[model samples]
Target chain A: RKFFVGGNWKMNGDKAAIDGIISFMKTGPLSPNTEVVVGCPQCYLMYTREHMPANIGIAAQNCYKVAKGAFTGEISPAMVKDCGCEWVILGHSERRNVFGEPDQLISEKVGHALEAGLKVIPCIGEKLEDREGNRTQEVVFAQMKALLPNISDWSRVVLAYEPVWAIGTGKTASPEQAQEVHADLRQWLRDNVNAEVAESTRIIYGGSVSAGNCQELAKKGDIDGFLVGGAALKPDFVQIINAR
Target chain B: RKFFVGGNWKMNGDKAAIDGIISFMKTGPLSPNTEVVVGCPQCYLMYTREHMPANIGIAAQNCYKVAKGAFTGEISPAMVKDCGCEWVILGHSERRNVFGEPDQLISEKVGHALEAGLKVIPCIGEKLEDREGNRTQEVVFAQMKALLPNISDWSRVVLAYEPVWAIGTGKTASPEQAQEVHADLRQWLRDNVNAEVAESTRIIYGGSVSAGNCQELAKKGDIDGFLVGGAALKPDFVQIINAR
Candidate 1:
């Protein structure tokens, strides 16, 4: 499988900005084999999905558990799938830590998403204190444990390890710091889940990932992908994709 | 031209309810001339659009002024247009009264929506007290005045009058009461704007409008159309469309 790159345009872009970003991608050079997906605010899903070329895919940042109707401020898995969204990013640290989303709820969401025939990039990460205390392995495993029963199929799931302390903070994670965690997650999956699932799962890194640092992280043998944050908003995003 | 009818489901319906609604609508006979549109939640736009037959158009209950980047809890107009949404309901009383969306902002939104080339059913109504106190004409005109400058053409805009006290209250405006206001608003448009603009614009009554009383209101020459509330959820919605 080729490297997978996902851009999360968290709370950014306007009308002209969305078109500009889409147009830039159209003209830019990205690794053709690498699966690229952009998570636009749900409002843009229709427009972005319609205009973006077939090679590039679109994802919703979050989706509601219910298939449809009446949950204000929520998108549904069926909706995105019906509208051609191949992937969805769920359980970001911001969603859990800021909005009070829980692990079990995330598990249910993953279950709903899987049944809807949508791919999911469920994000998991540890705080600065957790990393400092060397509890990164423990926190990552805890978050994945809730997802184990629901995520039996590895082909559709991408595990993202976003160092909570570094996202949007302009602090890039050292290659060793990131791979150490990615390698641990890979090993844990092999031991706990089946080997087939483990081998195919792409454990990506995220957290202030920029054009400058992405190449080094991609060089790590165990690091399979990236989930770009703030840097995803700029032309440098093309560089991040071609970093390999 | 035939009449146009749209159902603002608001924050209602779950999976079962949505499925039932779809099933019911599918079996029911909709008027070929009356353009029926349903406002599905953001999550179900694609699903509902996919499942519903070709005759019934899909509408969003509301959309943000900015189309596509990150405005939390706001859907953009550009997306609506791209998503193949022909109509967008804006300036609803709930958005105004509950969300505190000002009329000026509503005008700005209407302008943005027009720029995106999406048809708008912009709502404008007064409180019961405003009508009782004889301030109804002033309130309705004020709303029209704000949006008038932004609207390039009157044909794309449908004016919905939903009296605040009557919405969901089961207390409907009497035929005389509704026609009195409708005539005032229509004449107000002619006196201030232009005769062509006044005649071309569709001024619809929309507060607990039901099948029993629809004919009476529709009988009035000036009562161009209706914005049905509770009756919209029921099969009688078709009857409301058949009022003409």
Candidate 2:
């Protein structure tokens, strides 16, 4: 009965502000039942890892597929692992839509991260247009298909689903909407992968996740955890961690 | 009177490799006449800044224009400065050509970095096609023009010209060829901005710069410094730092 919660801080946080958050994270009395990880900015990987309590893990929100190269503005999974952190969040929508990272690139990134021996939280989501067009299944399933070959280990992968329309919109896909997708994803895993993977994979939800609605969302059978955003910076995050 | 050298490690360096580089940098019979900075991977800003001598500054290889938001896979200027680094290398060729960062976007990044009180090394380069097409002047000048409005301070800027065709190609842009472009750039600064900026700005060359060619590149009237690549990872970089 392990629940997972990852806080994607995005491009936010400085030492002073990070210190405040880490302080709250440590006042933790953290739920040992839930595994907690904070995805910080690349520059703060070392700082956050070194400062935060060992009970909580640290993650780089994104990293490149290669170990080292002329890819300016990108960090490698090796560098992420070398920072004393073990997790990386790949294919966040911001990386996809905002930064133009396509599914193929994100797939390679996931493969490389896995090969580098780091755990991954690979995100997949559909935007307002795709959902409205009723193509959510095709879009999300294809994204899953792209990530399938590279996911060498299901245990090391936390599959995150964030509806692009809901991200930071001060709302979330209704629990029913999210559950439908989560259930469908599990079915895809069962049919495409195996029953074991379908049962074991942790399908987390993201997109305007807050303390206000975490519990209701947590009740869904297929939604195993959360990939948090803005609200994760607050006491609400601790609540989200204990939602189960 | 000031000569500047920025070693852009560009998507490379782990703590282990960085330690070796920093060791050579420390053993430096460093030159008193030149200013040296290392544009390290974003994740290594604090690590490199902490490990390297304060005389040799640290810079984020790239940073976002905005302070903080949902822009994943990016670090903000605020976070870069918080890591105790004072410089950022904006618009490197990899960022431009590889990542598709346009002149306008790079301009915004430079503006934001400056707004955040960090010195900027904004790169401008002409591709092989642009050069072959005899439009290097038009391209580089337009790139320069794109950067003008956002450049609130010439004093804080180190304009880096890395002929995209020459970078990592193991061929220096013949001293005369490089000088022609650098001189044209300076002339543009004098004509469009002011003579003071033209004279004071350190226009650095950054294509295949090694110990073998640093001295010759340094000999050019308009080439004020060098933005090193592969050779910067080795002992020879110390020699280039002192080429002037």
**Which candidate comes out best when scored by TM-score?**
2
Predicted model with the maximum lDDT: 2
Residue-level lDDT of model 1, residues A87-171, one tens digit each, is 8888887677745578888888888898889999998998889989989889989998988888846788999899989887878
Task: Name the lDDT of candidate 2.
Answer: 0.91
Q: What is the CA-based DockQ of model 1?
A: 0.15
Question: What are the lDDT figures for the candidates, one per model?
Answer: 0.78, 0.91
Segments in model 1 whose C-alpha atoms lie over 4 Å from true places: A13-16, B1-6, B9-38, B43-235, B240-244
Candidate 2: deviation at residue A45, Å? 0.7
lDDT of 2 at B204: 92
Per-residue lDDT tens digits for candidate 2, residues A108-173, read 999999999999999999989999999999999999999898999898998999999989998698
Error of 2 at B95 (Å): 0.7
